[model samples]
Target: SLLIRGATVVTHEESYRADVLCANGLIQAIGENLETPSGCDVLDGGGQYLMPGGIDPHTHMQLPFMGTVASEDFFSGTAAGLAGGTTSIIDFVIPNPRQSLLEAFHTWRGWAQKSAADYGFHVAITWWSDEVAREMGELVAQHGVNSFKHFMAYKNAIMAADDTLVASFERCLELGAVPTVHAENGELVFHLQQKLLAQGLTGPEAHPLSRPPQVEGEAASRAIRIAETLGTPLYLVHISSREALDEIAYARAKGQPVYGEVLAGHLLLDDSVYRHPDWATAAGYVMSPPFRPVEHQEALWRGLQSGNLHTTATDHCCFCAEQKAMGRDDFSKIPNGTAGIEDRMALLWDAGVNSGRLSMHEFVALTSTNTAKIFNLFPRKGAIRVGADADLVLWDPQGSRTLSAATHHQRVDFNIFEGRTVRGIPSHTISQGKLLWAAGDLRAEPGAGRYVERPAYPSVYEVLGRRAERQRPVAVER
Candidate 1:
């Protein structure tokens, strides 16, 4: 049992002073000067802001890619998230073209079972086969997985051609799941990479040149047109370019149910990172839909404030400085990712709310509330009301902290936001009614985090009661 006193609670509608009571891992009650119960622990939250714990809807932990593995597994990554006030995450499970979806899901489950914070999976569909489409139904109805991810980039590696994308969109309608895409043109990227390497311009400086903003915009537009043609809604993930957002904003203006998510790195930093001169520094900025020039970053912020973008997440697949060095001569070999899950909420608070660009309620919406509502985790995970989980964060808005690998908790050697300062910090992080972290102290027990089974809800892209309008998916002949 716990009682948090004198904190200003920020909800979607407004912010006000209140005391929050918790028992058995749930918020029990709220009011001014609540009575203390016997055997209850009390925390003084004077001058602090109490809000729902953050839900990072995009991340890759301990994922294997490109001859190396991401450094943080479930335990390390969730602990990193906890230290930063995020109480939940949605990690992607990408299966190889030949592996069964269920096999990869269970494999990923084995790795994530020891997380220190509650978690869920967004299954990535790498190939479109009849058996796989049937499995997707079981995944949704029996396994509680409500989302599907498609990589529109990576060419022959992971990219689903237009045919596959169309088939998957139709299947998602039939199965009650929504399709989220990594929107980048694979063929253009592949040819450009080969051309750049042939021209002896294989350095990290040439990384962004291989796949420019135009390609991203083209892919986004193509995908949107396909969805609109089929009346299937879509979610674009880690959208970094103004070109891409232009497509989303245009589709949304037409009421096509297109949604956008920008990454924290793309929100705060820009493409100057690829020009760091030194091999490691330059190579670190090699993520797909690569970080854009400063103007695009500005455009992304504008999109966020104006509701053109729905949420912010970290495509948080990290490779250490040593791993980044792998692409010393060839930037294409650099594992494409960086770490920001541990700094998302604080950095956004300081850069957005404190900077007058976003109201505190908007800040809460971006970091927690909106994500829950989009992913169907609301009421259970994203609210501070009487029935929600005790996943809460106490924030100290008066303090400042410099971000650095030496001082942070992510299991990586480099902090993408290294040396930057943020005014807001999480004073205490509570998950499932337990104090998991406080003022640099971590007390979470191993395996304390459980896999959250969300209720499988149909995609928001469909017209009301249009499930019958969905065609029965024709099983591909094996």
Candidate 2:
């Protein structure tokens, strides 16, 4: 048990000063000058902002892709997240072609056992079969997975065909699960890659050229259209371009249920990083839907500010310099990822809140609240109310720090946000009622994290049923 006093509690809807008492891994009480119980730990918040710990809805810890496994595994990645105020993550469990979803989910569960903070899984549907459909239901009904991921990119690898998507989108509606997409036209990307490589334009500079905004825009539109036709909610991940943002905005304006997630790196960095004269420096920024032009950054910020985008995430997959070298001569072979798990919260606070663009309530929503509600963890993980999990961050709005790989807790050898100083750092982070990080001192213990099971959509069937009835055609009585 712990008693944290003197902080102003901030949530998605409001903020006020109160003393919070946490017990049995949940928030027990909130009141002015609450009396501390015997044997309970106490901390003086010094008027910091205590908000729900961040929930990064997108991450790929310990993933195997591009002929190699990611360098940051579950243990290291979640520990890194704790150091930066994130208490939970929804990591992907990607099955190889022809693999079983159950097998993949179990494998990722085993890999995530050493996590130092809470975690959950979002299983990806790589290939389609009657068996795959059955297992997706089994996952939702029994394994507590409420979301399915589909990759429209990776062309020959894990890309889903139109038939696969059409089939799975309907399956998700039947199961009341969300259908999420990566939103890139994989065939176009493959063709562009071949064209670039044949012309000897194979450096990292060609990375973004092969996957310009049109590829993402088209895919986003296609995914939204499919979900609209099928009456299923859709989530587009790592939306980095204005083209994709426009698709999401248009679909929402048309009354289609579409949600967008913006990455911290995409909002802050630009494609100019790909043109660095140094090879290592340039290759370090080789994530898919690669960073956009300067103008797109402004558009993304607007997307978040205007409520077109609902959440902020990192797509936090890490690859060391050595791992990235596999494609020294072929940028197409390079791993598509970058590290930002430990930098996301601070980067957004510095760039969004400090810049006068986002209010504190809006910041909480983007970082944690919105993601929790979308993923079915709301009120328990995203709220500060009584009986909610005692996962929280004490944020010092005046705090400042320069982020670098040398000082960061992530296992990756490179930092995408290196040398970027930010204000509004987390002075302390509490996970599952334990004070894990405080005053730059980390006490994360391996295997201390627990797996969080997310149930399927609560009222999806009712809403879908209503819409279906409204759109149904009735023959005139003869």
Candidate 3:
């Protein structure tokens, strides 16, 4: 049992001082001057903000991609996230082009057993057939997957064709699940990469030129329209450019129920990293939908501020210096991912709340609350109410830290936002009613984290299904 006293309980809706008691892995009570029970541990919060632990909507731990496994496995990644105040992550499971979905899902489940915090998965529809269609239903009904991912970008290997997207989206509507996409036209990216290589511009600088904002815009519009036609909600991952932002905005205005996620790196950093003189340093910023120009960063901030973007994530995939060098001669070969699972909350608070761009309440929404509701993990995981899981973070808003790979917990060598100092930091992290991180001391245990099952039939599906019925394609009775 544990008791947290003298802290402001903050949630997306409100903030007030309170004492919270925890027992049996859940919040047992919440009020002023709560009595501390016998043998219960008491933590003096010192007036810090007791917020729900963060839930990163997108992450890829222990992921094998582009010929190599990611440097951060489930244990290391989740432990590091505990240090940073994130207690849950919705990671992706990408089945190889014709592999069985249930097999891939089970394999990922086996790998995530060592995680130290709660985790879930969103299975990708890389290739389609009757088997794939049946498996999607099984995943939703039996395995607790409420969302499916589609890659419109990785051309030859894992990209889903137009037919696949249509099939999956329709299946999602039929099953009351949400469909998400990585919006980039694969054909255009492949064609441009060849053109740039032919011109001898095969370096990190050519990576962005090959997949411009228009490439993303075209794919986003296509996905949105597909969802509109089929009456399913869509979630676009890593909306990086103004071009793509506009499409999300338009579709949402038409009441299409489209949601967007912005990366912490995209909001604070610009495209200048690609031009860093050191070849290795430049190659490190090689994630897909490469960092946009300075102006695009402004648009992304606006997207988050205006409510068009529903959540924030890191797409937290890790690679070391050697892994990045695999593309030394060809930019297309560079692993398309980055590391920020341990830095997203600090960076967002320092830039988002401290800079006056977002309030503390809004910060909680983008970082944790919205994702929970969108993915069907609500009151249990993203709230500070009594009876909810006691996953929490005590934030020291005045605390300061200069972020660097030398001092971070991520299992990687290079840091994307390295050397950037942040003002807000987590002083304590509690998961499953136990203290995991206390005042910079990490005490996380492998395999302590459990798999969270997200059931289907989220609220959006109900509304969309009704709308689709009214506009159903009825037979022409002539």
Candidate 4:
């Protein structure tokens, strides 16, 4: 047994002073002055936030792109995640053309077997056919992965055409799987890039110009339209623009089941980074849906506060400066992605909660609970309930730190958020009743992570029935 005492408990619905007791990997009780069993470990929460460990629903570990691999592997990536108070991560699996969905599952399973914290996977469907769609059902039903990710970008590599996307979405709906999309118009981006290159505008600034906000907006509108037409729930990933958020809001207003996420980098950084005096900073900020104009940052923050942006995820795929130099002169050749898995929680707490942009409850919801609920990993992974798994974070509200490549725990050679000072940090992280990180050190080891089969939609029938019964019924006249 373990007792976390004198903590300000932050849950999805409320925040109060309480003590949490855990035993056998489950939360045994939550109340003021809870008694600890004999020999139980005691952690002083010191009036700081005691919240559920973060659930990062979007991350890429060892993802292959542009002929190289992401800098952090499973062990390194999850270790960093845990250090930052995230106890669980749901990574995506890239399915090659010739490989079966089952084969991809096995491949991802092998990779995750070495993770240092709990994990789940979102299967990326690269090819669409009746057989592949059927396989998707089996992947969810038997394999326990309840989500399918389809891309509308990447042109020929991973992008799905509108027809293919609609078909896949329909199939996922029938199978009770949430369909996620990378919302961007790839063909349009390619055409614009070609035009810019032809005009000799090949600098790093051309990156955002080639894939402007209009492109993202159009894709978001189209994705919501497809989901509405098919009556399938959709999740738009890494949403970066006001227009995109507006599209999602419009869909939700009309009762479409849709959710959107904004990454930490998009919320904190802007296009100026691409024009930095130091070329390395410019090179390090080369991610897709490139950083929008400075005004977009406020728009993203507004979306976050209003619940239009449902979650804040890292999308923490790392590529070192040496590897990013691969595209230095041309700008288009630089590898994409920024590192933040190790800093997301602290950064958000400093900016969002500490600065009064979001309440502590909203912070926990966006950082942890909402992601798990949306990704169908709730109850078991997202909250601090009696029956839920004992995944928790003991934060140090007065703890201050400056993040840099030198001090980061991720196995990457660079830190995109380097030199930023944050006023809050995680003092300890617990996963499955085991302390995985404590006082700036890792207590967990590689292969300690266990694969979890996610639940499907958290009582789908109950929701559907409640929706039906709440409607006015027509009177029958005989």
Candidate 5:
């Protein structure tokens, strides 16, 4: 049992002064001057804001990618997240062509079992097969894995064409699941990469050159059109461009259920880092949908502030300098990732909230609540109300700190947000009613986390025209 006394409870909808009590891993009560019960461990939350722990809807812990595995495995990744007040995460199960989705799913489960914070998965469909489709259904019904991921980039490796997308999109509708897209044009990216390398332009500079914002915008519009034609909902993961944001906005303006997200790095840093004159510094920021120009960052912030962008995630896939050096001379082989799972909330708060770019309401929504609702983890995990899980963050809004790889818990050796200062910080991170982090100390236990299988959408919708046809009464039972 735990009682956090005298804290300001903040939710996206509202904020108020309250005392909260947790017992048996659930929030038991919230009210003014609540009586402290026997055997309850009490903590002073004076001058603190109590909010739901963040849920990173995007991450790549221990993922095998680009000829090397990500350095931050499940244990280290989740611990870093816990230290940053993130209590849950949704990682992708990206499979190789030779592997079965079911086999890959179980393999990721084995890796994620060591997570210190609770976890879920969004199974990435690398290739479309009838067998894979059948397994997707079974995974949802049997294990509650309801979200599917698709990529339009990576060309031959993981890209899906429109036809493959059509089948998978329709099937997810039948299964009551959502399809998340990595919106980049694969063929164009491949061609551009080949062109750049052929022209002897093999530096990190070639990464963004090969994959420009135009491709991302085109893919977003294309994916939205496909979803519209199929009449199914779509989620765009790690949206990083003004062009892509406009496409999502256009769809939403016309009443389409389109969604958007921006990474913390995207909001803070720009493409200038790519030409930092230091090769290591340049390549470290080389994730796909590569960092955009400075002007793009303002647009991303506007979307975030206006509520057009629904959530913020790190898309954290980390590699050390050694792994990142794979393409030091070749740029195309730099493994394409950086780490920020531990700095997301504070960085966003520093750059967004305290900077007055976003209100406390928008901050909480982007960081935790909206992501929870979108991923079907709401009410259970994202809320600070009664009956919600006690995945709570006690925040010191006035506390100050500088983020650095030296202090961060992620297994990576570099921090993209290194030397970045933030005003608000997590004073205590509590998960499952157990204190997992306080100040700089970690108290997480391996295997303490559990797997979460989110519920499928309630009777997912098929195309309205098709539904009407199926339901229309046959003429005289002909």
Candidate 6:
């Protein structure tokens, strides 16, 4: 048994000062001046904040992209996640063109067997065919993988045609699974890129120009319409612009089963960073649906606070400076993505809470609870309550730290959030009643992490239905 006393408990609905008692991997009680059990481990939570551990639903570790692969593998990636107070992660498992979905599942299982934190996987559907669609159903029904990821911007390599995407989404609907799309118009981006290159505008700054806001907005609207036609739920990943948010809002206003996510980098960095004097800085910020203007950052924060944005993810695909140097000259050839899994909690806490852009309750929901609910890990992974997993964080709200590549725990050479200072930090992280990370170090072993089986889509049906009934005007409340 473990007792945490004198803490300000931040739950999804409200906040109050109370003591939380946990026994046998579940939160046993929460009240004022609770009695501690004998032979229990007592953690001093006075002057601290107690929130559920974060759940990052979008991540790509050791994923192959372009000609190279991501830097961090399972063990290192989850270890870094632990240090950041994230208790669970759901990574993408890319199935090869010739492989079976079951084969891909086994391969990912082998990779995760050595992970240092609890994990789940969302199968990436690159090859869509009648056989593959059938296999997807089997994968979900039998293997417990309830999510499928389809790409909209990889061109011929991995991109799914509109027809293929619709067919796959219909299959997911029939199989009781959720369909997640990367929501960017590939043809539009390709055409725009060609025009830019013809005009000799190949610098890093031109990246965003090639994939402008309209591309994402139009693609999101199109995807939502298709899903609506099929009577299916859809989740748009890594949304970056206000135009995209507007599309998602339009769909949800009609009570369509649609949700969206925004990455930490897009909400923090802007397109101007691509024009930095240091070439490396510009090159490292390159990613799909490239960073938007500073005003977009404010809009994203608003979306998060208002509940328009359901969750925040890292999209933590790492490619160090050395690896990113591959496309330094052409900018188009440089590997895409940035690292932030180990810094998301701190960054969001500082900007979302301390900066008054979001209330404490909003911060907890966007960062952790919402993520778990969206990915079908709610109750077991998201909240701090009776019969829930003992996944909790002891946060020092007054603590301060500077983020740098030197201090980051990721097995990479650069920090995307380099040199940024934040006010709040996680002093300790407990997963399943086990103290995994404490005081700047890891206490869990790599193989200590377990694979999590997820539930089907609309996992938060009751909660969302209740919120809808209230017709609460959504706004990013500071």
| Residue-wise C-alpha lDDT for candidate 4, range 1-478, written one tens digit per residue | 7789999999878988999998888898999999889999998887588999988888898888766889899999999999999988888988876568888889989988989888989998888777788888888888888888987877868788888888888887777788888888989988887898889876778788888887898999998899877667788989999889899988889877789988888888888778877777788888887888888889999998887889888887889888888876666677778888888899999999899999988989998899888877777777988878889999898999899899889888777688999998999998888888888778769998889888665454345346656764788998
Alpha carbon lDDT of each predicted model: 0.86, 0.92, 0.92, 0.85, 0.88, 0.83
What TM value does model 6 have?
Answer: 0.93
Candidate 3: where is the Cα deviation over 4 Å? 473-478
The TM-score of predicted model 3 comes to: 0.98
lDDT of 2 by residue, 195-277 (tens): 99999998999999999988999999999999998899899999998999999999999877789999998998899999999
Q: Which digits, one per residue and each the tens of the lDDT, describe model 1 over residues 1-478?
A: 8888999999866999999998898999999999988989898999999999999989899989877999877888888899898999999989998679999999999998888999999998899899888888888898878888999888777778899889888887777677789999999999999999999998888889999998999989988888777667788998889999999999989867887888888888877888886778777677988888889989989999888898878888889888887887788888898887889989999999899999989988888888887777888888999989999999999878899988888888888788998999999999998888888897766688888876655437346236435654688899
lDDT (Cα, tens digit) per residue for candidate 5, span 253-311: 97677789789988878887888788888888999889989888999999887767999
Better of 2 and 4 by TM-score: 2
For every candidate in turn, the CA RMSD to the true structure comes to: 3.6, 1.0, 1.1, 2.9, 2.5, 6.0
Native RMSD of candidate 3 (Å): 1.1
Clashes of each: 0, 0, 0, 2, 0, 3
* Estimated TM-score for each candidate: 0.96, 0.99, 0.98, 0.95, 0.96, 0.93
lDDT per residue for candidate 6 within 1-478, as digits (tens), equals: 8888899998777889988888877788888898989988888888999999888888888888877999988888888888888888889888876567778888888988888888889998888777788888788777778889988886867787788888888888777678898988989888887888888887788888889888998889888888877767788999998988988888889878788898888889889888988878887888887899888888888788767798888888888888888876666777888887888888999988998888878878887888777777777877878788888888999988899988888878878788999999998888877777888778768787788888775544454445556765688889
User: Between the candidate structures 4 and 5, which one is better when assessed by TM-score?
Assistant: 5
What is the lDDT ranking, best to worst? Answer: 2, 3, 5, 1, 4, 6
Give model 2's TM-score versus the native structure: 0.99
- 417, model 2: CA deviation in Å? 1.1
Candidate 4 overall lDDT versus native: 0.85
